[PDB]
Design a protein around this ligand. Structure first.
Ligand SMILES: *[C@@H]1O[C@H](CO)[C@@H](O)[C@H](O)[C@H]1NC(C)=O
Lengths: 49, 120, 105, 105, 120
């Protein structure tokens, strides 16, 4: 902990399906929301998850 | 555990004063310390905190900007460095221990015995 | 996150039992400590973390309570144990002490 | 509920990046919009609701920030995009525009 | 969306002026509109609001009592009705859209292009 913040510690907040036990994913890409093709833009409901 | 504080007396409104807190017994590093004032005829209220090395110091109201707390475990003491004071924070001051940094740190708490500062 | 001690001064004789309540502005768990400050002394701590008192404090001092409401109980102290009492939290930064409750006769 | 834009005029060349901050007197979430007013034109809007810019605004314009502190960023605009900028809220009534920040060279 | 405003010119300090705002494109009902002035050489500041039919009009400072904003979706326009004016609110005026009434209203915003009023 640090005053002003300590931001080393991220976490996935958005994914596709339910992850199975005891594997991981470091596939840092865009996130896609709906029926729009964003696929690596942002702003209009795209993300970094 | 033991705590001995020093740097009390009478000053003028607009001088400085070395507020020092010496610790022994328990290991002075791995441990979070802080200060607490009490104006005579009041309750209890805190001053400033330091986190086991100088990377993060939090402050209270109306003492931010006149108070620079620093610790140094290579000479195992604590400082407030009251600086350019007011004629209204005449009080008694105590250095106390918040406690704990790792999992094996066995949190115990202890207090000093007071340091009196007065103004003119 | 501000503490408060709502019972004011009391007039319990050397005997009987006393029960002192401390609240909190939000959820604090097993993080309180009690202090008993005489007229003009250092505030001596009483109770580690809501349940176990420290060394040199007898068994008639007991500390309990949970959630956001905490209680210190004197079973049958003695003919002196009249001072002011404080509840302090060590959840986060920094440790707020509250208001305080005296006792008289 | 009054907006404010605390960075004053800046002198960033056609290149480099610029970062402009807008506060609020209380909690406003995803409700700000950015305007870029030239000398003597209509104030053209930039960004829907803190995250998506409207049509006809390129990708070098980006808008982010949250809580009560919001930020507009120019990555590498061009050799003209120097005007005054405004932040407006649509939380309640009515929409306050703040102060404004010019840019020079 | 489109917005066209009309009713600018030169007046005297103590006359009236029809400030009208015509809208098309998007449906003029189900949508909250308002006005915003700018004195030349200043920033931006608002005037008055109307809520999709006349049931609730909010006003700003020093314009309450000289300004009667009204909408009428059976002829799809907006009015300020500047009335008994001052020689200090010479400015430019814009009608803009606050947005949204139901859940299906897809909030989009748009601005006019200004109407200039001057005093003597
Ligand atoms: C092996 O590759 C898969 C790819 O589907 C990955 O999910 C998995 O985590 C990898 N194994 C380990 C031990 O990380």
């Amino acid at each position: 902990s640090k005053v002003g913040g300590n931001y080393n510690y991220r976490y996935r907040l958005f994914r596709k399906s339910n992850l199975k036990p005891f594997e991981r994913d470091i596939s840092t890409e865009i996130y896609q929301a709906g029926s729009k093709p964003c696929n690596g833009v942002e702003g209009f409901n795209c993300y970094f998850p | 555990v033991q705590l001995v504080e020093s740097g009390g007396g009478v000053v003028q409104p607009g001088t400085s004063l070395r507020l020092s807190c010496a610790a022994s017994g328990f290991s002075f590093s791995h441990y979070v310390m802080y200060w607490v004032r009490q104006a005579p005829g009041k309750g209890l209220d805190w001053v400033a905190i330091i986190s086991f090395d100088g990377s993060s110091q939090y402050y209270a109201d109306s003492v931010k900007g006149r108070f620079t707390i620093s610790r140094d475990n290579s000479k195992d003491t604590l400082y407030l460095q009251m600086h350019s004071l007011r004629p209204e924070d005449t009080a008694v001051y105590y250095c106390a221990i918040h406690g704990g940094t790792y999992y094996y740190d066995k949190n115990i708490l202890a207090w000093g015995q007071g340091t009196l500062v007065t103004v003119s | 996150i501000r503490m408060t001690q709502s019972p004011p001064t009391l007039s319990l004789s050397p005997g009987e039992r006393a029960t002192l309540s401390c609240r909190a502005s939000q959820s604090v768990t097993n993080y309180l400590v009690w202090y008993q400050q005489k007229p003009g002394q250092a505030p001596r701590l009483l109770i580690y973390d809501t349940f176990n008192r420290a060394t040199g404090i007898p068994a008639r001092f007991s500390g309990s309570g949970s959630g956001t409401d905490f209680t210190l109980t004197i079973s049958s102290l003695e003919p002196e144990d009249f001072a002011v009492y404080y509840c302090q939290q060590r959840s986060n930064w920094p440790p707020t002490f509250g208001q305080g409750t005296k006792v008289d006769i």
